[PDB]
Amino acid sequence: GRRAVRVWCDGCYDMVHYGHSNQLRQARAMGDYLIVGVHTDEEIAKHKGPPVFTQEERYKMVQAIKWVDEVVPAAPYVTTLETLDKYNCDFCVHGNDITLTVDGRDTYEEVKQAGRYRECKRTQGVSTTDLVGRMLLWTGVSQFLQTSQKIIQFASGKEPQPGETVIYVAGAFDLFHIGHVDFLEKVHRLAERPYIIAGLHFDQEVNHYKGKNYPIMNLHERTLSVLACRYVSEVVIGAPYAVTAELLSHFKVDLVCHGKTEIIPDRDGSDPYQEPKRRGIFRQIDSGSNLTTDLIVQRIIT
Numbered sequence: 355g356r357r358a359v360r361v362w363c364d365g366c367y368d369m370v371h372y373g374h375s376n377q378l379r380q381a382r383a384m385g386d387y388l389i390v391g392v393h394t395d396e397e398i399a400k401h402k403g404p405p406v407f408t409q410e411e412r413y414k415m416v417q418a419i420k421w422v423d424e425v426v427p428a429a430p431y432v433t434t435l436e437t438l439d440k441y442n443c444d445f446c447v448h449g450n451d452i453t454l455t456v457d458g459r460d461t462y463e464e465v466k467q468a469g470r471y472r473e474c475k476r477t478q479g480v481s482t483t484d485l486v487g488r489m490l491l492w493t494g495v496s497q498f499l500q501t502s503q504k505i506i507q508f509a510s511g512k513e514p515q516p517g518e519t520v521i522y523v524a525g526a527f528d529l530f531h532i533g534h535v536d537f538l539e540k541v542h543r544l545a546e547r548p549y550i551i552a553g554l555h556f557d558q559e560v561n562h563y564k565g566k567n568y569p570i571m572n573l574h575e576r577t578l579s580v581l582a583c584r585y586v587s588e589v590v591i592g593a594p595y596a597v598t599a600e601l602l603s604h605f606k607v608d609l610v611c612h613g614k615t616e617i618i619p620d621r622d623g624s625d626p627y628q629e630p631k632r633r634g635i636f637r638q639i640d641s642g643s644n645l646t647t648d649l650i651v652q653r654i655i656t
């Protein structure tokens with residue numbers, strides 16, 4: 355009936371960003387199903403420094419990316435034909451980095467010789483070193499070039515259907531991380547057919563209430579980061595800090611959630627959730643995670 359083409363990727367996925375997401379999207383577009391091998395903390399420490407995020411954090415983050423069908427924990431550092439056969443994958447997909455042994459032989463010679471290796475395009479605008487750099491520091495630093503096409507590639511493109519519960523969440527969603535995934539995952543359980551709209555605050559607003567040099571990622575980068583998450587149906591690309599009556603009617607919102615993090619008051623001292631609270635449609639959800647963008651900055655610099 356086809357047959358199905360099963361695609362393999364592997365990696366560390368330590369500090370996942372929209373570059374990793376875009377690479378996984380590309381890999382999935384080359385077949386029908388995507389399996390991602392993720393290395394253990396130990397295996398990574400053998401080859402380079404130990405990772406910032408624990409293997410179980412990294413596993414969970416990768417599984418939350420909507421193009422990924424399954425995560426294989428404890429994948430070997432280098433892709434082999436044996437691993438591809440074990441998971442019945444036709445080929446693996448990696449970036450175009452030079453990957454040579456000390457001798458000048460390709461790290462992936464085996465897989466490449468068997469014709470089971472594919473390259474995907476490198477993602478413009480981000481890398482893990484760039485993001486580290488931003489964290490060691492509002493007018494914006496990213497050279498990401500957002501386009502209608504990148505949004506189309508990342509967006510599910512679906513409108514709310516009859517029977518679907520529209521649920522609005524809002525925030526910075528900066529350095530979109532496992533705390534956000536845990537939040538969104540719980541929100542997604544609140545209805546049988548959830549349609550989650552994530553409202554992303556403007557860069558200048560985030561800087562105002564989060565301070566310092568925040569946000570690390572600009573509105574356009576955070577747009578792609580949130581759209582990659584399997585729990586998200588739509589994003590408001592520049593949402594007001596106050597959850598307004600206009601927003602609630604425009605999107606026909608059924609429920610509004612916020613996590614157990616602190617809600618900073620609005621410019622005028624008001625509760626930015628006052629309207630949905632008055633309507634009786636506000637629900638606080640405990641994500642069970644204490645991870646914040648501020649604490650990631652701390653784990654990554656230290």
Ligand SMILES: Nc1ccn([C@@H]2O[C@H](COP(=O)(O)O)[C@@H](O)[C@H]2O)c(=O)n1
Binds near residue numbers: 526
């Ligand atoms: N660890 C975390 C981090 C964020 N969140 C929720 O995710 C949403 C977005 O958070 P930020 O604006 O801080 O990015 C908020 O509703 C916040 O309460 C959570 O519930 N648990």
